Structures are given as structure tokens and as C-alpha cells.
Amino acid sequence: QCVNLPAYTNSFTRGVYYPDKVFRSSVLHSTQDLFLPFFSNVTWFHAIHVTKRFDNPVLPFNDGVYFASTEKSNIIRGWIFGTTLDSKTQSLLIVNNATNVVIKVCEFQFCNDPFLGVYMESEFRVYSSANNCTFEYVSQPFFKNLREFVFKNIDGYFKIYSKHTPINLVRDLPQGFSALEPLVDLPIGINITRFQTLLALHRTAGAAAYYVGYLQPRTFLLKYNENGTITDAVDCALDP
Amino acid sequence: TRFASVYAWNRKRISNCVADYSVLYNSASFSTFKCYGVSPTKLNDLCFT
Amino acid sequence: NVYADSFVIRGDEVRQIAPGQTGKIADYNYKLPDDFTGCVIAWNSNNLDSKVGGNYNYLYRLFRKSNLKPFERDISTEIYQAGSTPCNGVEGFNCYFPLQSYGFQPTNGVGYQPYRVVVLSFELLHAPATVCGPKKSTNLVKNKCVNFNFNGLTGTGVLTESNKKFLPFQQFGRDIADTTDAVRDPQTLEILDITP
Numbered sequence: 244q245c246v247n248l249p250a251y252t253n254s255f256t257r258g259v260y261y262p263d264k265v266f267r268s269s270v271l272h273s274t275q276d277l278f279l280p281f282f283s284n285v286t287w288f289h290a291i292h293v294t295k296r297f298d299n300p301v302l303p304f305n306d307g308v309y310f311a312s313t314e315k316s317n318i319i320r321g322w323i324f325g326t327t328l329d330s331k332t333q334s335l336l337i338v339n340n341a342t343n344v345v346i347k348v349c350e351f352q353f354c355n356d357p358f359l360g361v362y363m364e365s366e367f368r369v370y371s372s373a374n375n376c377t378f379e380y381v382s383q384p385f386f387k388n389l390r391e392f393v394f395k396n397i398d399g400y401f402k403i404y405s406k407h408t409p410i411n412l413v414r415d416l417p418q419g420f421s422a423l424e425p426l427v428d429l430p431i432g433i434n435i436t437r438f439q440t441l442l443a444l445h446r447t448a449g450a451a452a453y454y455v456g457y458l459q460p461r462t463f464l465l466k467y468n469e470n471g472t473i474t475d476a477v478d479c480a481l482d483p
Numbered sequence: 484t485r486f487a488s489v490y491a492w493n494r495k496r497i498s499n500c501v502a503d504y505s506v507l508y509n510s511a512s513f514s515t516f517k518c519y520g521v522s523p524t525k526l527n528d529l530c531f532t
Numbered sequence: 533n534v535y536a537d538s539f540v541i542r543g544d545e546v547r548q549i550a551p552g553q554t555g556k557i558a559d560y561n562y563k564l565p566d567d568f569t570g571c572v573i574a575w576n577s578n579n580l581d582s583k584v585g586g587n588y589n590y591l592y593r594l595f596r597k598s599n600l601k602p603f604e605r606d607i608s609t610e611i612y613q614a615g616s617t618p619c620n621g622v623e624g625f626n627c628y629f630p631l632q633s634y635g636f637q638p639t640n641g642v643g644y645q646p647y648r649v650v651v652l653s654f655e656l657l658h659a660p661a662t663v664c665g666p667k668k669s670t671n672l673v674k675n676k677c678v679n680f681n682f683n684g685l686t687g688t689g690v691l692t693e694s695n696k697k698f699l700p701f702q703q704f705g706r707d708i709a710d711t712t713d714a715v716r717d718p719q720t721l722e723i724l725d726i727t728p
């Protein structure tokens with residue numbers, strides 16, 4: 244029914260992911276790819292304080308997005324990816340409506356302020372209309388948590404890498420190292436330049452925060468364990 | 484309207500022009516188009532001597 | 533990862549479905565990546581896709597502001613503005629509807645008859661595979677010099693049982709020299725070491 248209604252932080256060596264599915268042990272592998280520049284400025288958005296802050300602007304999607312979110316009550320529900328985000332062109336909807344994971348590539352007439360509602364889930368005010376839908380992909384029905392995602396759009400494939408990590412922290416991006424694992428490759432085949440996060444409001448925002456950084460073509464030196472796991476990396480353009 | 488015979492073939496000089504061959508997309512259909520010493524996808528980005 | 537892309541084009545444009553081609557199809561309708569792995573299959577379907585009085589169901593994009601990226605699909609149908617004058621959703625002078633219809637008649641010349649194209653895309657020998665060719669499997673022979681074929685990976689060596697544990701999305705393991713030294717048996721999911 245389509246109802247109506249900057250901060251910066253550091254990326255302490257975050258956003259590294261597994262480049263392939265081949266098992267390797269005890270090796271240093273050098274890779275050139277789209278990575279998050281180590282120690283670069285991400286942008287900070289939040290939703291807090293019953294309403295004071297509800298950050299869901301339309302951000303660019305340049306070559307890929309690192310998306311992190313520190314939350315405790317599942318406010319972040321998914322994203323919208325597209326180029327014009329209206330029914331003229333095709334768009335990608337990824338949403339978790341508390342029961343399924345819905346991945347749709349349709350022609351959406353999005354709301355100016357899209358969100359979902361919890362009163363129990365009560366509202367799905369995302370888009371006015373869906374037409375000409377090409378792709379669908381669902382699942383089975385159904386600050387403490389840091390959830391990191393890397394979104395890439397290459398050769399017609401939408402690649403998603405993800406990692407959920409338990410944290411215990413008050414304010415900012417946890418300084419650490421964690422390698423993201425391949426989540427899914429979707430053959431959506433669309434043109435993506437902008438994106439927007441889908442939040443769930445209470446009927447009040449709640450409390451959650453997410454950070455957005457942009458990937459760039461970088462050279463990284465990845466270190467593989469004696470097991471398959473990636474334990475460290477080097478950003479060759481960070482410093483001498 | 485008229486092409487030449489293969490035995491006496493026609494040569495035409497082309498100069499001072501922009502080779503925007505997408506103007507042919509509306510009217511022309513070519514069974515053969517093979518380029519030598521150049522890639523077809525690079526033709527939009529070159530100046531020919 | 534077998535994918536089947538399918539469509540119908542003119543016969544004269546079948547050459548345009550290949551890596552590194554240019555033309556109305558490769559530019560505005562369907563582009564293949566340069567590092568394409570897979571197969572392109574085409575065949576004349578004049579007796580199916582052409583009817584008397586023309587068959588006008590099959591469309592193609594004639595105008596587009598820029599070339600497509602590989603494997604990108606554009607189904608927008610907004611007026612293409614060919615001049616400086618703006619088009620406000622109305623076809624007119626220097627304003628063209630971007631899609632045009634093939635005219636497929638049974639007596640069209642072979643260059644103008646419909647051809648059904650199928651492009652199969654897949655990757656080879658790097659990840660678990662669920663589609664295979666019709667080859668019968670033999671019993672496993674270990675501790676002996678054999679020629680082997682594991683999920684398409686052929687070779688020669690001695691097969692021995694392995695201690696490695698692959699994550700579920702992994703099928704092969706490699707060395708510093710990048711040769712395959714561990715494999716997972718397809719019939720029984722047991723890791724085996726390959727030794728020269």
C-alpha cells in the first residue's frame with residue numbers, strides 16, 4: 244500500500260572471501276579481484292530510538308557491495324537491487340519475511356519507502372506491482388550478531404558471499420579477520436547500479452545498524468591453513 | 484542499384500567520415516562478416532587511415 | 533553448472549552467437565562472454581516457426597543506447613530517442629519503439645528463415661557436478677597403477693585411501709604444483725589420495 248514516513252567508520256581488514264571451490268592447504272595464494280580496500284571509510288547507517296533514526300537510503304552499487312550489520316532483533320530483512328527501481332526495468336528482491344527466503348527478479352513498482360511490518364509479521368509494503376517476472380528462488384518455511392555479505396554482479400551472475408559471527412560490542416565495526424564463504428550464484432542477468440536495504444518496523448524502528456563499503460580492483464595475498472580455511476590476507480596497496 | 488562484375492571490380496575511396504555501422508542494423512543483413520587483423524568488437528573505437 | 537539459453541533468430545545471425553562477435557544480435561540482444569566455455573547449437577526451424585502471412589511473435593531489439601554486457605537480458609520497451617528532441621513516451625520523428633518483429637514467412641530465403649539456437653553453458657572439472665555423459669563405471673582398484681577417470685578427471689596413478697576432509701561444496705584438492713592429489717569418490721563419498 245506504499246505508505247510514506249552521514250557517518251563513517253573504518254574497515255579493519257574486512258570483506259575477504261573464498262575465490263574458488265578448490266580445496267587447498269598450507270599455501271599462500273595471490274589473487275587479483277574485487278576486494279574491500281583495507282582500512283577504507285565505510286558509511287554508517289542505523290535504526291534506533293522509537294521515530295528518531297530509520298536509515299534506508301538508495302545507495303549506489305558500483306562494482307560490488309560489502310554490507311555488514313550489527314543487530315540483535317532481526318531488523319534487516321533483505322535488499323532491493325536494480326538500476327531504476329521502478330517498473331520500467333527489472334529488479335531483484337531478496338527478502339526474509341520471517342517464514343521464507345524469497346529471491347525474485349521481477350518488474351517491481353517499488354514504494355518510495357519500502358519496508359516490512361511487525362505488529363507477528365503484519366505488513367509487506369515493498370512494491371505496488373510485480374510483472375514480467377523471470378527468476379524465482381525460495382527456501383523452506385519458518386549488539387549480539389554481526390552479519391557480513393559481499394554482493395557482486397559479474398557475467399550475468401549475482402554472487403553472494405555471507406558470514407554470520409557472534410559478537411558482543413556496543414558501537415562500531417569489530418576489528419578482526421574472518422573469511423566470507425560462497426553463499427549462492429544467481430543467474431539473474433540484470434543490470435544493477437543502485438540498491439536499498441529492507442528493514443522491518445514495529446507498530447518504531449527498534450535497534451540495528453549496518454555499514455556499506457564498496458569494492459575495488461585490488462591485489463590480495465591470501466594465506467590458506469593446513470585445513471582449507473583462510474586465516475590471513477595482505478592488501479598490497481594499503482602501505483609500503 | 485548496381486554492383487560491378489567480379490572481373491572488373493569497383494574501388495571507392497572513403498575519407499572524412501564516421502563509421503557508425505549501426506545505421507546498417509535497420510536495413511542490412513549480412514551472411515558473412517569476417518575481419519582480419521582487427522577484432523569486430525574493436526571497430527567502434529578506432530580511426531582508420 | 534549446465535544452463536540452457538534458448539531463442540529463435542534469423543538464419544543470417546547464427547554466426548553472431550559466438551565469443552567476440554559484433555552485430556545487431558551480439559550488441560543489442562544477446563552477448564556471450566569472451567572466455568565462454570560451452571557449446572552453441574543451432575538448427576533451421578522454418579517448418580515450425582514460420583507461418584503463411586508471416587509469423588510476428590518473435591521480436592528483437594533494434595535500438596539501444598549502449599551494448600549489452602555478457603549474458604545480460606534487456607526487456608525494457610521505452611521509446612529510443614535517436615535525436616536531441618525528447619520523446620515523452622510517444623513514437624514519432626526521431627523516436628522509435630526499440631523492439632521490431634521478425635517477419636518469418638515459409639518462402640523467405642534461407643538467410644531469412646528462423647533458426648532455433650541453444651547455448652549450453654557449463655564449467656568443467658572444478659566443482660561437484662551433477663550432469664554426466666553416458667559412461668559405465670567400474671569397480672575401484674587401489675594400490676595399483678591404473679588409468680582413472682573420476683567425474684571426468686582422467687589420469688594415471690596409484691589410488692590410496694585419504695585422511696583429508698573436504699567441505700561439502702568441494703570435490704577436488706590440489707598441491708602447490710596445482711595438480712590434483714585428492715579426490716572424492718562419486719559412488720562412495722570417501723576421500724582418496726592420488727600418487728604417481
Ligand SMILES: *[C@@H]1O[C@H](CO)[C@@H](O[C@@H]2O[C@H](CO)[C@@H](O)[C@H](O)[C@H]2NC(C)=O)[C@H](O)[C@H]1NC(C)=O
Pocket residue numbers: 340342343345364367381384
Ligand atoms: C512470505 O513469502 C512467501 C513467498 O510468497 C509466502 O509463501 C507463499 O504464500 C502464497 C500466498 O500466501 C502461497 O500462494 C504460496 O503457495 C506460498 N508458498 C510457500 C512456498 O510458502 C508466505 O506466505 C509469506 N509469509 C508471510 C508471513 O508473509
Ligand SMILES: *[C@@H]1O[C@H](CO)[C@@H](O[C@@H]2O[C@H](CO)[C@@H](O)[C@H](O)[C@H]2NC(C)=O)[C@H](O)[C@H]1NC(C)=O
Pocket residue numbers: 374375607
Ligand atoms: C511484459 O509485459 C508486457 C506488458 O504487461 C507484456 O505485453 C503484454 O502481453 C500480453 C500477453 O502476452 C498481451 O496481451 C499484451 O498485448 C502485451 N502488451 C501489453 C502492452 O500489455 C509482455 O508479454 C510481457 N513479457 C515480456 C517478455 O515482455
Ligand SMILES: *[C@@H]1O[C@H](CO)[C@@H](O[C@@H]2O[C@H](CO)[C@@H](O)[C@H](O)[C@H]2NC(C)=O)[C@H](O)[C@H]1NC(C)=O
Pocket residue numbers: 468469470
Ligand atoms: C583443522 O582441522 C582439524 C581436524 O578437524 C581440527 O582439529 C583439532 O584437532 C586436534 C588434533 O586432533 C584436536 O586436539 C582438537 O581438539 C581439534 N579441534 C576441534 C575443534 O575438533 C583443527 O581445529 C582445525 N584447525 C587447526 C588450526 O588445526
Ligand SMILES: *[C@@H]1O[C@H](CO)[C@@H](O[C@@H]2O[C@H](CO)[C@@H](O)[C@H](O)[C@H]2NC(C)=O)[C@H](O)[C@H]1NC(C)=O
Pocket residue numbers: 326327434435436597598599600601
Ligand atoms: C545499466 O544502467 C545504467 C543506468 O541506467 C546505465 O547507465 C547510463 O547509460 C546511459 C547510456 O550510456 C546514459 O544515458 C545514462 O546517463 C547512464 N546513467 C548512469 C547513472 O550511469 C548503463 O548503461 C546500464 N548498463 C548497460 C550495460 O547498458
Ligand SMILES: CCCCCCCC/C=C\CCCCCCCC(=O)O
Pocket residue numbers: 497502504507512513516526531554555556
Ligand atoms: C561505407 C564504408 C565505410 C567503411 C568504414 C571502415 C570501417 C570498417 C568497420 C566497420 C564497417 C563494416 C560494416 C559492418 C556491418 C555490421 C556487421 C554486422 O551486421 O554484424
Ligand SMILES: *[C@@H]1O[C@H](CO)[C@@H](O)[C@H](O)[C@H]1NC(C)=O
Pocket residue numbers: 245246247248355
Ligand atoms: C512519499 O514521498 C514521495 C515523494 O518523495 C511521494 O511521492 C509519496 O506520495 C509519499 N508517500 C505517500 C504515501 O504519499
Ligand SMILES: *[C@@H]1O[C@H](CO)[C@@H](O)[C@H](O)[C@H]1NC(C)=O
Pocket residue numbers: 252253254282283284285
Ligand atoms: C577516512 O576519512 C578520514 C577523514 O577524511 C581520513 O582522515 C582517513 O584517512 C580516511 N581513511 C580511513 C583511514 O578510513
